Design a protein around this ligand. Sequence first.
Ligand code: HEM
Ligand SMILES: CC(C)CCC[C@@H](C)[C@H]1CC[C@H]2[C@@H]3CCC4=CC(=O)CC[C@@]4(C)[C@H]3CC[C@@]12C
Ligand code: NA
Ligand code: NA
Ligand code: NA
Ligand code: NA
Length: 396
Amino acid sequence: LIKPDVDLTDGNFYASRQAREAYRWMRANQPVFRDRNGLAAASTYQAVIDAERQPELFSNAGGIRPDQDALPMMIDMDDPAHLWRRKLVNAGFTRKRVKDKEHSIAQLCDTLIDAVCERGECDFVRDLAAPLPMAVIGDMLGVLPEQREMFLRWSDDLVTFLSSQVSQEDFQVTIDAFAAYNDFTRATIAARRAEPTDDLVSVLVSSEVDGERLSDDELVMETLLILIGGDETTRHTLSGGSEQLLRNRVQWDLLQSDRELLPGAIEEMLRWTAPVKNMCRMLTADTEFHGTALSKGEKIMLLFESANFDEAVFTDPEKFDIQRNPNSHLAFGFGTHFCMGNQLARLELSLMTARVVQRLPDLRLADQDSRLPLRPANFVSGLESMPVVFTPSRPL
Ligand code: HEM
Ligand SMILES: CC(C)CCC[C@@H](C)[C@H]1CC[C@H]2[C@@H]3CCC4=CC(=O)CC[C@@]4(C)[C@H]3CC[C@@]12C
Ligand code: NA
Ligand code: NA
Ligand code: NA
Ligand code: NA
């Protein structure tokens, strides 16, 4: 095994399909790894957990992304300022409020499958995996159903070109996407100030943190955080997890034969796909961390996918096993910033996967001998496309 020569900010690393071999080297030889440019990364399950449990030393207030300033959103804040924001919107994502959405989310799943069932084929990414979480979080945000496609396109342009090697033409698209989203959302904020609604934008507009109204800048960025959290994450577990079911037919047959295996299947899909490849922390002081000296002010990447394949926690991690138990993956992170939408994501995954294995029972990849492309982006990433085939059925 040769040491990886990699740039962890280069989107191409996360699409090369040699990332997990690079992770394996890190976990065995330098758990807190420094890449070709010296960027520090926590590669082992233990190192990620230890960093998450010490927010006083591993801060979010420097921003969660490499080479990027902190923004006015709660994921870029430390406690208690971060907690004050979480409490404004936590109520919409509790176990009961999520479960009470099952009928509406199930209806969206069937509407989306109704749109492709007569075709006998679709792009599983474009036509099922991406639109379902978009519709769910769009409804909570007050996005009109006919404008979901517009918001998802903005969202895609905001994350799919995150890379130290981004081209000028892709960078311009990211800039233009934020400008359009910013203009639209500021108009939305003014509309909800005149006529409040029950969507999350109106909730944030009507909120106070420590007795102060949220700034218009923060309102735009908190709304965007909720949007991207909803529509650029679950989609990759839906597509990538379904792909592993199709590529490991024993697992697909197991789930089709026993529906009570669905909760465990969802957890293994989450472990395998790890849509959030990394979150950054900024060191507030010099420290020695798992054999690596870290300096105050530098950033360290928490490699969630690397932790999800750590042999110290998972037996035979390269085997897709929907019956894996326990399955304490870190797809949702850990600590005070643990994913607020973890329950909503799991229900999105459960309802769509159950309806896919029900209404597309003979689902297959259009070419089982192919290798599907992954998005070369350094933050969230998954399958770009996924052509599938099935026997047509009639809509419901
Ligand atoms: C498979 C689906 C998802 C994955 C893998 C995922 C992953 C993550 C991760 C890794 C974090 C940071 C945790 C840390 O740094 O320790 C996070 C935070 C967050 N996620 Fe999720 N997420 C998913 C779905 C969602 C959904 C559906 C929403 C809906 C709004 C959402 C909203 C958020 C928010 C607001 C935060 C910031 C929480 C905070 O800073 O306290 N996520 N997510
Ligand atoms: C997956 C979720 C839990 C976290 C979501 C983080 C999103 C909202 C964050 C992460 C990366 C950020 C972008 C970083 C680069 C860029 C510089 C600009 O010129 C303005 C907009 C911005 C485009 C940011 C807008 C939204 C950002 C995308
Ligand atoms: Na790779
Ligand atoms: Na800043
Ligand atoms: Na654009
Ligand atoms: Na197949």
